[model samples]
Target: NSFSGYLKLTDNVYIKNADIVEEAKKVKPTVVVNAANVYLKHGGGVAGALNKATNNAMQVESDDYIATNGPLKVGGSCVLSGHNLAKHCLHVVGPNVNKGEDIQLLKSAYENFNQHEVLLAPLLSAGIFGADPIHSLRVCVDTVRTNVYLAVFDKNLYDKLVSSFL
Candidate 1:
């Protein structure tokens, strides 16, 4: 079901159980967040979906970005034209837990989006990167000041967020 109202986990936050890209489509002119790799490969998961949504324009732009400036550091970010789904896309590299990185970098990912007014992001480092969901979920709660939307694809994680922060 569509989220009836703000998840109430955090004031000014919106939570939806769906694909981030799909949720992004609903909020036009907003920044869509992508949990990306330092190389900006746009190959799989959030990166892949974002590339597909933008008809590869994001990937093309990311390619140009990387070739010009080199790989982006973890917790670092950049924005690309949305190409269609929204106004712009925010690419932030999350820390990989397996590599000994932690919430500090993931927290920075959310921090990197501070200049933007609206956003839709996933639980960084909680999927393939494998940070504990319980901890990863709190990063945003503690970081954002503007209107933020969280698109959660994992059921248990979604439930945890709803109950813990509600």
Candidate 2:
């Protein structure tokens, strides 16, 4: 039996161990981030789940955006509708760990999330994209300077986050 408020990581950042999609519904007026690929395709992981939940609307909108704008750039982001889940969704693309300038790219990916309101993002580029979770978390910690929530879902990653942060 417990109700912990945001567990502080920094003066602004907090750890929120919940599914980004489901937990987003309980909160008022926030955007859930998708650790997206450069193609804007949501085929696996959280992006895939989000795309499914939105009835493929997320994919459609993202496709249109990509068709019009070409593939999203590394360390760049674009906003799409939340589709009744939250406010708008921000899809930010992070780099593969071994890619050139990976650390800088990861930092810039988190840097793209410039918002005044609440925003939740998972550990960027840590999975599928191949960055170490600890490194990515550290990059997020150093880069994000807003009311950012680090949404943790996986068991191992959650353990790492807790042990690493606190």
Candidate 3:
């Protein structure tokens, strides 16, 4: 029997520790995308708690995989900038930071490079946690051809988002 997990509306994208990498790989993502850089001292520290939580929860490297300003600053061959550490990071700039189009690059990265596993940590207030779930899911789904992973700290934000998306 294959039991599928239903993502609640207000919870962040949750993955069992055992399946994080596997699930991430399934997506075949090339780069990790971030909406805001609140994890760093430069930013408002909005996601500092969440960033720390992610590090403690997953034992993954949190060194050079985030950007301070946005995803547009990330280039093809740069090391990376920001606080939330992982593997590769992409920061998107523009008005969409609070909007839902930021994930387009992550989706494009897969199509452009054919890679796997992209991590996303957006500012919930920006749009990830917006009142509209259907719109968020549409934007998220439209970007990737494979699985998508988002690490969020707030349950309400996650629930509202996943409820409309998954």
lDDT of 3 at 2: 16
Ranking 1 against 2 by lDDT, winner: 2
Model 2, span 76-119: residue lDDT tens: 99888888666788899999766664667888899887653567
What does the lDDT read for residue 18 in candidate 2?
A: 76
lDDT of 3 by residue, 16-135 (tens): 212222322343334444343223222223233333434443212233233333222311212233233445544333133344545433333223222334343342224432324334
lDDT of 1 by residue, 57-145 (tens): 88889999999999988889888777777778788888998888865888887788677877777778776787887787788778877
Give all TM-scores, in the order shown: 0.90, 0.90, 0.42
Best by lDDT: 2
lDDT of 3 at 19: 27
**Which sequence of candidate numbers ranks them by lDDT, best first?**
2, 1, 3
The 10-residue segment of model 2 with minimum total lDDT is: 1-10
lDDT of all the models against the reference? 0.78, 0.79, 0.35
The per-residue C-alpha lDDT of model 2 at residue 40 equals: 92
User: Which runs of model 2 end up more than 4 angstroms from their true locations?
Assistant: 1-5, 98-101
